[PDB]
Amino acid sequence: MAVVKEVLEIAEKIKNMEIRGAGKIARSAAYALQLQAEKSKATNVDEFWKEMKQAAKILFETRPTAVSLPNALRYVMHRGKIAYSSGADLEQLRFVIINAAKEFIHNSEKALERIGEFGAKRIEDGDVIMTHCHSKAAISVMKTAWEQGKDIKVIVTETRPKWQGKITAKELASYGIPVIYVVDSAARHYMKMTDKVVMGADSITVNGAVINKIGTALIALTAKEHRVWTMIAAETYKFHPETMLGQLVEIEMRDPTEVIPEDELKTWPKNIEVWNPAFDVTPPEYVDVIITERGIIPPYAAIDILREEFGWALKYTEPWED
Amino acid sequence: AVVKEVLEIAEKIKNMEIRGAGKIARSAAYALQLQAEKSKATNVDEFWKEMKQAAKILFETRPTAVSLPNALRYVMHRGKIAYSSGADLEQLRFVIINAAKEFIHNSEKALERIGEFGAKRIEDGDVIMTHCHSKAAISVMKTAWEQGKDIKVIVTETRPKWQGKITAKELASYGIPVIYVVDSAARHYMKMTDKVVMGADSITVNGAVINKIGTALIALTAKEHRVWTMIAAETYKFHPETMLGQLVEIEMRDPTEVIPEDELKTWPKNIEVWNPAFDVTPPEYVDVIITERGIIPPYAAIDILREEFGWALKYTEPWED
Amino acid sequence: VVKEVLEIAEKIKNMEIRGAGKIARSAAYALQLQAEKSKATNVDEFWKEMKQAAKILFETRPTAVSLPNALRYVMHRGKIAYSSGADLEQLRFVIINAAKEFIHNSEKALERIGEFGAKRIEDGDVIMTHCHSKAAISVMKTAWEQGKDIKVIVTETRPKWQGKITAKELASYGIPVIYVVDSAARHYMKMTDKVVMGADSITVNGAVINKIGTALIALTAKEHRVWTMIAAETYKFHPETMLGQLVEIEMRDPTEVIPEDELKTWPKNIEVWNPAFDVTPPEYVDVIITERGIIPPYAAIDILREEFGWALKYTEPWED
Amino acid sequence: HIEGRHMAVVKEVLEIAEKIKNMEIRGAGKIARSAAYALQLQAEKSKATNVDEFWKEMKQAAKILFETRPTAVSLPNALRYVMHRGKIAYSSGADLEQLRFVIINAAKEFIHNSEKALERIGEFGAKRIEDGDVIMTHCHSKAAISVMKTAWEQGKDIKVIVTETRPKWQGKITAKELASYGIPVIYVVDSAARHYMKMTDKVVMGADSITVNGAVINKIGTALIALTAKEHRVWTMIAAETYKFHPETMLVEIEMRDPTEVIPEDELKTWPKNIEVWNPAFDVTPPEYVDVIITERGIIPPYAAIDILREEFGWALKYTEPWED
Amino acid sequence: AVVKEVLEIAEKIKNMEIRGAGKIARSAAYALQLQAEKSKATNVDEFWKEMKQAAKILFETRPTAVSLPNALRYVMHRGKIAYSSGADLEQLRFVIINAAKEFIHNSEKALERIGEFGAKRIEDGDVIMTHCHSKAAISVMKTAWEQGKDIKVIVTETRPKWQGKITAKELASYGIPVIYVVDSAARHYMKMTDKVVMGADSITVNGAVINKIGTALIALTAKEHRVWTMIAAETYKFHPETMLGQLVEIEMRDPTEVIPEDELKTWPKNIEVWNPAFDVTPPEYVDVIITERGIIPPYAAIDILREEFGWALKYTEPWED
Amino acid sequence: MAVVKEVLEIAEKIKNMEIRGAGKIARSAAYALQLQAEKSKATNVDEFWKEMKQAAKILFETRPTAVSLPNALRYVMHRGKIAYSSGADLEQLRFVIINAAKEFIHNSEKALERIGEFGAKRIEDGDVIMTHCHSKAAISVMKTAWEQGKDIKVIVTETRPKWQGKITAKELASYGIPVIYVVDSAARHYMKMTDKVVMGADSITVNGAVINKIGTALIALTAKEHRVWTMIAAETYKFHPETMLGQLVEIEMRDPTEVIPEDELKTWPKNIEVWNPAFDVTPPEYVDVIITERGIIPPYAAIDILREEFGWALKYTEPWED
Numbered sequence A, F: 001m002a003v004v005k006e007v008l009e010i011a012e013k014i015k016n017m018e019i020r021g022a023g024k025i026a027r028s029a030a031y032a033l034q035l036q037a038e039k040s041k042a043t044n045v046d047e048f049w050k051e052m053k054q055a056a057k058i059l060f061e062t063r064p065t066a067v068s069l070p071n072a073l074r075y076v077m078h079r080g081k082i083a084y085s086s087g088a089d090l091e092q093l094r095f096v097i098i099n100a101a102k103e104f105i106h107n108s109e110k111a112l113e114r115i116g117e118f119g120a121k122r123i124e125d126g127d128v129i130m131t132h133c134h135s136k137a138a139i140s141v142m143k144t145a146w147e148q149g150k151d152i153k154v155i156v157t158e159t160r161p162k163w164q165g166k167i168t169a170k171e172l173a174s175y176g177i178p179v180i181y182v183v184d185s186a187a188r189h190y191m192k193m194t195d196k197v198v199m200g201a202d203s204i205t206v207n208g209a210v211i212n213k214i215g216t217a218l219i220a221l222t223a224k225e226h227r228v229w230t231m232i233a234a235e236t237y238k239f240h241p242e243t244m245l246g247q248l249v250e251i252e253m254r255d256p257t258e259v260i261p262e263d264e265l266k267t268w269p270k271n272i273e274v275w276n277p278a279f280d281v282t283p284p285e286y287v288d289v290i291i292t293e294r295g296i297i298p299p300y301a302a303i304d305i306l307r308e309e310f311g312w313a314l315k316y317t318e319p320w321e322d
Numbered sequence B, E: 001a002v003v004k005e006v007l008e009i010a011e012k013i014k015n016m017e018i019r020g021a022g023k024i025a026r027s028a029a030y031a032l033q034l035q036a037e038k039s040k041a042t043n044v045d046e047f048w049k050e051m052k053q054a055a056k057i058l059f060e061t062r063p064t065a066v067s068l069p070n071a072l073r074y075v076m077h078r079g080k081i082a083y084s085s086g087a088d089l090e091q092l093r094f095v096i097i098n099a100a101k102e103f104i105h106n107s108e109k110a111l112e113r114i115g116e117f118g119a120k121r122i123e124d125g126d127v128i129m130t131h132c133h134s135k136a137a138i139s140v141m142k143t144a145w146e147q148g149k150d151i152k153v154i155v156t157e158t159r160p161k162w163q164g165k166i167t168a169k170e171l172a173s174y175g176i177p178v179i180y181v182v183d184s185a186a187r188h189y190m191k192m193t194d195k196v197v198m199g200a201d202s203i204t205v206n207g208a209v210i211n212k213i214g215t216a217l218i219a220l221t222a223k224e225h226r227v228w229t230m231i232a233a234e235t236y237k238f239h240p241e242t243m244l245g246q247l248v249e250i251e252m253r254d255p256t257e258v259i260p261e262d263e264l265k266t267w268p269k270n271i272e273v274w275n276p277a278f279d280v281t282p283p284e285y286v287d288v289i290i291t292e293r294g295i296i297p298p299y300a301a302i303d304i305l306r307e308e309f310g311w312a313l314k315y316t317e318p319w320e321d
Numbered sequence C: 001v002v003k004e005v006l007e008i009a010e011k012i013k014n015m016e017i018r019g020a021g022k023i024a025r026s027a028a029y030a031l032q033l034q035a036e037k038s039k040a041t042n043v044d045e046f047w048k049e050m051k052q053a054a055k056i057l058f059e060t061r062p063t064a065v066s067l068p069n070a071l072r073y074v075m076h077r078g079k080i081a082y083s084s085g086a087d088l089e090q091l092r093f094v095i096i097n098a099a100k101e102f103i104h105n106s107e108k109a110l111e112r113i114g115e116f117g118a119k120r121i122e123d124g125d126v127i128m129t130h131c132h133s134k135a136a137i138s139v140m141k142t143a144w145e146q147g148k149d150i151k152v153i154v155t156e157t158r159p160k161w162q163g164k165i166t167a168k169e170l171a172s173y174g175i176p177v178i179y180v181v182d183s184a185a186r187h188y189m190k191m192t193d194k195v196v197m198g199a200d201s202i203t204v205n206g207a208v209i210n211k212i213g214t215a216l217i218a219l220t221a222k223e224h225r226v227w228t229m230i231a232a233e234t235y236k237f238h239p240e241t242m243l244g245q246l247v248e249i250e251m252r253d254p255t256e257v258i259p260e261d262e263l264k265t266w267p268k269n270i271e272v273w274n275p276a277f278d279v280t281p282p283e284y285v286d287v288i289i290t291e292r293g294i295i296p297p298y299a300a301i302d303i304l305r306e307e308f309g310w311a312l313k314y315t316e317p318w319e320d
Numbered sequence D: 001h002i003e004g005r006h007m008a009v010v011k012e013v014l015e016i017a018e019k020i021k022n023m024e025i026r027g028a029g030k031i032a033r034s035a036a037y038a039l040q041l042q043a044e045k046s047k048a049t050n051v052d053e054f055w056k057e058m059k060q061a062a063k064i065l066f067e068t069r070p071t072a073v074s075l076p077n078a079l080r081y082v083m084h085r086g087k088i089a090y091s092s093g094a095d096l097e098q099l100r101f102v103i104i105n106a107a108k109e110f111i112h113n114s115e116k117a118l119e120r121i122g123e124f125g126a127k128r129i130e131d132g133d134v135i136m137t138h139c140h141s142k143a144a145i146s147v148m149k150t151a152w153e154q155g156k157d158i159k160v161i162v163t164e165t166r167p168k169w170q171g172k173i174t175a176k177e178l179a180s181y182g183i184p185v186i187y188v189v190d191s192a193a194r195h196y197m198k199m200t201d202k203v204v205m206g207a208d209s210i211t212v213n214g215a216v217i218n219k220i221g222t223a224l225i226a227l228t229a230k231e232h233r234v235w236t237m238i239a240a241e242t243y244k245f246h247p248e249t250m251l252v253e254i255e256m257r258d259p260t261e262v263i264p265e266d267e268l269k270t271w272p273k274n275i276e277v278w279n280p281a282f283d284v285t286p287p288e289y290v291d292v293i294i295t296e297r298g299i300i301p302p303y304a305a306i307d308i309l310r311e312e313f314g315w316a317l318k319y320t321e322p323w324e325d
C-alpha cells in the first residue's frame, strides 16, 4: 500500500468524472502509471512491480466497465510484465514502464490526426460522404480529405434525439465543406447518391462489431444494401475484449426527456412509454474497414489489435493481476 | 354540357376544399353520379358524350392525384362497357349511377375493411412497429385490439413533423400499450417486433410503395429480420406508373419543417437542408398489401388495377375517345 | 332433390369415395343425374332443385377441395345460362353438358399432366420427388417412355413411408432410383436437375399445400436454383389465402410416427406432433403442371376465375 | 549393465494407442483425453538424459498416437495441443527439466479442460437462451443437450422440439433423455422442421467436426434445418468442443453408411437392384447458416474457427506437424 | 385453295429473304390480309376455313420464329371471335383485314414508341450500359438524347460477332458519347452505371428474357448493384412457352464464329468450341419490359399474351380447329 | 552503396524486366540477399546487417508496384531483423538470412507443384471445371487432378482482350484434358453445368479480395449465385498488405489497341473512348478458398498469412527500413 499521490490524484479525477472521454481518460491513466514509475521509491524490481500493479489496479477499479481506460493500463502494464517476467532489473523495468506510457500518450494525442491521414487515403475526389452523430474521428477524415484538395460533399444525418448532426453540419460547414442536412429517416433514400459512409465508434467488440450512436446500424445496413464502402473511424484503445453475440441486453438506456421533453411528456398516458437507447450494435458484416491511428484493418482483425497493441489474451489474466 | 354540380365539386378538388385520397375519390365518383342523375340527354350517345366530358373536367383538376383518376376509371370503365355493348339510355345511366354508388359505399367502408383484413394476421401477443400516422395502419391495430388481442405497438417518431406523437396518443387512447422511440431506433428494436404495419400514400404498378420518408428503411431492416411486413392501402391508391429506379424526388417539402425558420437563418450558406416527403419501398420488402377487398402480394397490384379500374396497356382512358 | 344425388353425397360424407378426381367426377355426376331425372316443369323450379342438389353435396364434406370445384364448374355455367333467361330444357342441357365435360376432363387429367410435364424434362435429368403423387409420377413415367434417360431421387417421406411405394413403382418400370431419408434432401439437391412433386391443394396465390417435408425440399431447391414443378389438377386450386390468418392444416394420429406399443414405453411429458402437410411459398415453385397446361403460381387465381367462375365479390353459384 | 538404457516410447503410450485403434476407447473427449494423457505419461516416465533425446522420443510417442486413427478429429488436436507447446519450449532452448514440465503441464491443462468442456459449453450456450424459449434440435448431441439441460437448471422454462433424425432414430434417445430431466418435449418427423421453425426461438445442435471455414459437419439433415432456421432468422447455435475444429476443408461423400440402417435387410432383399439406398452419415452446414459455435472457451462466429485452430493448437499454414521433423 | 400473294410471302420468309422481328411478322400479317381481299368464298364458312389454311402455311414457313405466329395469332384470334360468333362473312372479311392493318401499323411505330416510353425512364446524366445491337434498345437511348438528356453509353463488345462495334459507331454518330469495353468489363463498370438497357430475342410466359449470350450476366451484376434494368421488346416477341430450368441450348451457332475455320483447323481434337447464341435472364433480374404499349413488370408477360394474342391455358391456335 | 555486385546485377535484370513472373522475381530477390550474405565484406554484426538492409532497399526500389518482390524481401529481412534484435552475432545472423533465403527459394520452386497437390484434393472425378485467363497455378490444379486419374473437363473462357484462353485451352488439351472453349459472356450460361471454379490471381488484398484479369469477378459472382465451389490458386508471396476494394480507381489501364486494332481504332470517332482495364476486384464473399503452397485457406485468412509469413503488422515498417 505505497501508491504515489499523483496516482490516487488522477484516479480521483477519473472516478469523479472530472476527466472525460476515451482519449483524455486513457492518457491520464497512462500518465498515472508513468508518475508512479518516475517517482517510485522501491529498492528492487520485485517490490517495484508491486507498486506498478497496485497503481494499475487502483485506476482500473474506478470504472472497471470502461473501455479506453483498461486499454491504457494494458498498454503500459503488458510491456512492463514482459520485461519483468523476462528478468529485467529495477531501473530497466522502470525505463520500460515510463517509455511505454509516454509512447502511449504521444500516440493518443496524435490519434485523430493520424486517423484522418489513413481515412483520407480511401476517400476519392468527387465523393459524397454520409455520416451520423458527431464524431471527431469521423470528422477528422473528412477535413483531411477536403484539405487534400479533394472535392467532396457530405450528407449529415440529423441524429435524433440530441441533434449532434447540427454540430457536424455547422462544423464541416466552417472548413468550407458543402453540407447537406437530412433527417435520420432519409438514410436509405440518399444512400443511392452516397459514395462513402464514414462514422465513429463508442467502442469496438472482439469480433469487430461497432457500438455507436443509435441509428448507426441502420445506415451501415442500407450501405451494405447499396454496396457503398463503409468505414468506421476509431482509435485502437476503443477496442473492447467483450463479445456481443451472447448477451442480449441493452447497452445504455437514457433519459426519456431527451426524446419527449418533461413539459410535454408529463401529459402522456401510462400506456405510452418512451425508450431512448443511446447506442445500437452494428454487425461486422456491414463494415468494410476500421480506421485506427496505426492504419486500416478489417473488422474481424479487432482481436489482433487487442493482442498486438494491448497484449490481451482470453487465456491470460490482466497484466496487473496476481 | 356538364351539370352545375359537377363543376362545383370539380372546383373544390382543384382549390382543395376536398382533400385526401378517400374524400377526393368519393367526391369525384359522386360528381359522375350527379351528371348521370341530372342529365337531360335523350340520346344514349349524347349522354355518353356528357359523361366523358364531365370525367375529363374532374380529371384535369388535380392531374397528379392518385385516387382521382381511379374513381373516374372505376365508374367510366363500367360505363364504357355498357355503352360499347349497345345498352340503352336507361341502362347506361343505371350502370353509371350504380357504379358510382358502389365505389362510394365501398370507399366509405375501405378503412374498416382493411382493418379486419389486416387483423387476421395479428396474433395475440404480437409486438407491432408502425411509422407516420396512417389511418389504414392504425385501423388494423385498433381492430386487432378490439378482437381481444393483447398487442404492443412500437411507434416511430417520424421526423420531421412528429406524426408519431399523434399515433401514440391515439393508440394509447384506445388503451393500447405504446412504446415510443425515435426513427433511428428502427433496426435496434426490430429484433423484438412481430409485425410491421404501415400505411401508403400510393402503390406503384410493381407493388413498390410510396410513403413518408424512412418507410423503406424500416421495411429494409424488417426483411433483414424476416419480420412480417404489411402495407395497409386502399385500392384507389394504386396507379399505372412506375416510380422506382430514378433519382427525381417525389415531393420536396419546405426545409423549415426540419430546421425552424428562426434557426435556419443562422447556419452558413454552404449547408443545404433537404426534406423529402417520401421514399420508395421496393416490393421485395413488403409481404402483403392490406386492401379493402382483401390481402394481396405486392406483385398482385397490377391485377387490382385490372379487376378494379379496368386498366390495361391501352393508351386510351375510359373517358378518352 | 333426386334419389341418386343423395346416395352419392353420402358416399362422400362417408368417405366411401376417396380421391381428388373420383370425388369431383362423382359430385359432377350427381348434378348430371339431377338435371337428367328432375321432373321440374318450371325453369325457376328446376334451378332450385339444382342449387339444393349442389348445396347438399357441398356440405357433405367441405374439407375436400375438388368437391366444391366440381360443383362450381357445373353450377357456374348453370347460373350464367339461367340468368340469361334460359328455358328449362336449355339450362338442363347446359348443366348435363358441363357435368359430362368436367368428368371427361378429370378422366384425362393425370395423362395430360404427365405430358405437359414430360415436355419440361430433359434426357439425363436427375429428378427429386416426395411422397407418392399420382400426378408427379405421371410426369416421370411419361418422360421415361419418351425415351428420356432419367434417374429419380425418392425421398422416404416419413411417417407413412410413401417413398417406398414411389421407389418400387418407378423402379419396376425400369427407372433407376436412389432412395434417401428425408433429411438428405439438401445434401442431394446439389446433384438434382429437377424437382417434381404433387399437391393436395393450391391456394389462390399459388402457395402449395402438400405432404410434410415438401416446403423444405422446395426451399433447398430454391437455394440451389433447381427447377421446381408442382403437378396438380385444376380442381385442386382453392380460393382461400395463406397470407391472412395462420391456418394449420390437419394433424394426424401420432401412432403414425411412433406405434402404440412403442409409444407406451415413453415418458408422459413427450408429445408426438404429426402434421399432414406444410405450406410451400409460391416463390419456391417455378411452374404448376395442370392437365390444361403449364402456368406460373401467380396465375392460380386466373384458373379459379376462368375454370370455376370463382370471384371475390361474388357468391357461390348454388347460393341465393 | 548398459546405462541410460531405456525404451524410447513408454509402454503406457503403446497400450493407450492400442486401446484407441481397437475402439476400446471412443468418443471425441475420451480419445483426446487419452492421447494427451499418453503424452503426459511419456513426459513423466522418459528415461532420457538430455533434452534432445527426450524431444525425439516425445515426437515418436506422438507419431505412434497420431497413426492409431487418422479419421478421428480430436486425436490429432490433443497431440497438437501438447506438442505445439512442447516445440515452443524446446526451440526456445529449454533444458530437460523445463521441457518435461511444459509438456506434463500442457497435457494436464488440456485434459482438465476436456473434462470440463461439456459443462462449460452448457453455460456459454445458456447465456443465449431465454425463459420460455422453444428450442429445436437434431440428432443426440451431448454438447447441445448440455446447453439445454443447463438452461433448464438456471430456472429458464424451455420446450424442445426434437427432430426424429432418421435413419438410426437418435431423436428417440434425445426425447427420452430430455423428458427425464423434466424438460417438455415435442417429437417430430425430420420433414416437419420448416413447418415448425416459425414457432422456434433457437436452434441448438451439435457437431462431428468444424472445418477451417467454420463449416459444420453433423448428422444428415442438420444443414437442412439450419437452412430453414436462416430463412426465419431463428438464432442458430452449434455446440462443439475446440478439439473438434479441423484444419481441412469440406465443400466423394463424407461417409456412406450401411443401407440396411434405412431399409432393414429382410425388406431390402425384396427390392429391385434397380433401387440404390444411399445413406450418407453427414451433410455439411455452411457457416452462413450458423450464428455462433458454442466452445468451452466461449461463443465465437463460425469464421473464427481458424483462430481457435491457431490459439489452441498452434496450427499455422506450415508443412509439418509439431511432432514431425 | 390458297392465294399466290400469301405463298409469295411464305417463300421469302421460308428462304430467309424477309428477315427481322418486325418485317417478318408484318409481312405475315399483310399476307393474312390479302387472302381476305382476294377471297372467292360464298359463305362465311368457306371463307374462314380458307384463311385458316393461310395461317397454317405462314406458320410452318418458320415455326422457330417468335413474331411469325404472333402476327397470325393477333388477326386469327379476333377473326375466330366473330366466326365463332357466327357473324356474317362480310363482317368477318372486315374484322380480319382491319385487324391486320392495325397490327401492321402498331408494328411500324413499335420502335419509335418503345423509344418514347423508355426515354421517360432515362434522365439527364444517366450512364447507360447495353449489350449486342438492339434497335429497340438503341431507340430508347436515341430518344432520351433527343429530349435534351445528357446521357453516356457503355457499349459491351458483345462477342463473338462484335455487335458492339455497330452499336458504338451508330450511337456516336447520333453524337452520343460512347465508352467501349470487353464483355468481361460489365461488372467492373456497373459501379458507375445508372441504367441497364437491353433488347430481347424473345420473352417467355414467366417474363424470362432470351437474348444474345452475356445479357443474363449483365442483368445479374446489375441486380447485384441495384441498377434499374429495362428490356426493350415488342409485344409480338412474347411467346406462350417456358425456357428456364433447361439444359438444352436455345440455338448453338457456327463455332468458326468464335474461332475462324483456318485457325480452328489447327487446334487439338480434344477441344470443342461452343457458341450458344443466347442465354436466359430470370425475370427477377429485370425491373420492367418496355413494350410499344407501355412499361410492364416481367411477370405481366402472361397478360400481354392473353390480351394481345388471345392466349388461353388450354390453348389451340385459332387457325387450327 | 556498399553492396556486392551480384546483388546489383539481379536488380538490374528486375528493373529492366528481364525476369518476369511473381515466382521468378521473388526467387531472384531472395537469392540476391543470399549472395549478399554469402560474399559479405563485413566483419561485425551491425556492418553485415546494415549492408543487408542497404541491399534490400535497392532490390525493393527496382519496381515499387511488384507484389512478390517486397514479400521475398520481407520474408528474409523479417527473420533476419528478428535474429538481429535478439543480439544475434555477426557469423550467425548470416546463417539466418541464408537459411531464410534458401528456404524461400526452395518453397517457391515447389510452389506451383504443391498448389497443384492441395487443389487436386478438392477436385473430384467427373468434375466440370471453369477457369479464366492463363494461370499457371490454376492450370497446375487441373493438371495434377488429371494425373491422379480424375476424369475432368475444363471449360476455358476466351478472356478478351488478349485471348489468354487460347493458350489455356491448347495447353490443357495437350495434357489430354477435354476442353470446352467459350466466349467470356457465356460464363453464367454454363455455370449451370460447372462443378468447380478454379482461377488464379495477380495479387490478394488484406481483405482476401482477389485482383485478377478482368472478368474474374463476374465469373465468381455467377458462381456464387449457383453455389458452385470457387477456388483461387495463388502463392503466399502474392498477398498484398493494402486495400483495393471500395474504390472507383482503376487497378491498371491498358493499351486501348489491345481491344481494337490500331488500323481500326483510328477510323473510329473521337466521342468514343475505349477502356481496357487490366483487372477487376473479386470480393472475398465470392471466393470459398484460396489454394497456396502452404495449404488451402479461407480468403479472410489473407491477413494471417501476411503476419506469419512476411511479419506484417500495423506497427509495421519494412524490415530493411527503420
Ligand SMILES: O=C(COP(=O)(O)O)[C@H](O)[C@H](O)COP(=O)(O)O
Residues within 6 Å of the ligand: A022, A132, A133, A134, A135, A136, A137, A138, A162, A200, A201, A202, A212, A213, A214
Ligand atoms: O455515438 C457517439 C457518442 O454519443 P454521445 O456523445 O451522445 O455519448 C459518437 O458517434 C462516437 O462516440 C464518436 O467517437 P469520437 O467523438 O471519439 O470520434
Ligand SMILES: O=C(COP(=O)(O)O)[C@H](O)[C@H](O)COP(=O)(O)O
Residues within 6 Å of the ligand: B021, B131, B132, B133, B134, B135, B136, B137, B198, B199, B200, B201, B211, B212
Ligand atoms: O405518409 C403518410 C402521411 O404523410 P403526410 O401526412 O405528410 O402527407 C401516410 O403513411 C399515408 O398518407 C397513408 O395514411 P392514411 O392511412 O391515413 O391514408
Ligand SMILES: O=C(COP(=O)(O)O)[C@H](O)[C@H](O)COP(=O)(O)O
Residues within 6 Å of the ligand: C020, C130, C131, C132, C133, C134, C135, C136, C197, C198, C199, C200, C210, C211, C231
Ligand atoms: O400429399 C399427398 C397425399 O398425402 P396423403 O396420402 O397422406 O393424404 C400428395 O402429394 C398429394 O395428395 C398429391 O398426390 P396425387 O397426385 O396422387 O393426387
Ligand SMILES: O=C(COP(=O)(O)O)[C@H](O)[C@H](O)COP(=O)(O)O
Residues within 6 Å of the ligand: D028, D138, D139, D140, D141, D142, D143, D144, D206, D207, D208, D218, D219, D239
Ligand atoms: O452427428 C452426431 C452423431 O453421429 P453418430 O452417433 O451417427 O456417430 C452428433 O450430432 C455429433 O457427433 C455431436 O455429438 P456430441 O455433442 O455428443 O459430440
Ligand SMILES: O=C(COP(=O)(O)O)[C@H](O)[C@H](O)COP(=O)(O)O
Residues within 6 Å of the ligand: E021, E131, E132, E133, E134, E135, E136, E137, E199, E200, E201, E211, E212
Ligand atoms: O441479340 C440480339 C440479336 O442477335 P442476332 O442478330 O445475332 O440474332 C438482339 O439483342 C435482339 O434481337 C433484340 O434486338 P432488336 O431490338 O433489333 O430486335
Ligand SMILES: O=C(COP(=O)(O)O)[C@H](O)[C@H](O)COP(=O)(O)O
Residues within 6 Å of the ligand: F022, F132, F133, F134, F135, F136, F137, F138, F200, F201, F202, F212, F213, F233
Ligand atoms: O491475370 C493474370 C495475368 O494477367 P497478365 O498476364 O495479362 O498480366 C493471371 O490470372 C494471374 O497473373 C495469375 O496467374 P499465375 O498463376 O500464372 O501467376
Ligand SMILES: [Mg+2]
Residues within 6 Å of the ligand: B303, C298, C299, C302
Ligand atoms: Mg393475373
Ligand SMILES: [Mg+2]
Residues within 6 Å of the ligand: A300, A301, A304, D307, F304
Ligand atoms: Mg485472425
